[PDB]
Amino acid sequence: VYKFPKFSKALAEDPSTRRIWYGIATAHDFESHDAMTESKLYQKIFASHFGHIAIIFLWTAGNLFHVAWQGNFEAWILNPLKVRPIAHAIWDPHFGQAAYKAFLKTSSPANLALSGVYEWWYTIGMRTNNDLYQGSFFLILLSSLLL
Amino acid sequence: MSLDLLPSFFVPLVGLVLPLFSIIGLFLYIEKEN
């Protein structure tokens, strides 16, 4: 019932479940935290910005890797108007045989890609599932830099 | 071990084990005292 809202002693003394709920919803309101100065505020915001950009780059790297690994980017290059892009494969134990058959695309059940990443990456000059892997590797390196 | 075994190795791992340990840690942390 203590020590969770480390940034707020008023919440940490709450004997109810409201402390847990308000601890989540006030975690990023740095200006309202206990023992707070402006320098610490700007420094924490700066570090949070770095972590956020790292998260964005990791998300993009994950999209690239999953298109390279479980997608049909190379097949879509040769026939972009008939082949439907694949986002990533599906492994869900709750599937029946009918669901597996219906979601089956090429070798495994997979989700069609509605993000338009296939067309975007094709336009900027990507033609191989090894070009996407290089992008994922580089973006994970950039995320490490930002962290 | 082929690459197609990775989903069956990772999806249960992440989607069940990570919730369990994360719940353990979060409950322990939010139920601490001083």
Binding site: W69, N130, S144 | -
Partner: peptide, 30 residues
């Protein structure tokens, strides 16, 4: 089709990015 080595080293590099993330997470304090 990417190889096992390609996926494995990407997983290893992802682990390194994870240790860098907790270091940033712990440095942003409890």
């Amino acid at each position: 089709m990417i190889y096992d080595s390609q996926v494995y080293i990407a997983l290893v590099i992802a682990v390194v990015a994870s240790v860098l993330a907790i270091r940033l997470g712990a440095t942003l304090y409890n």
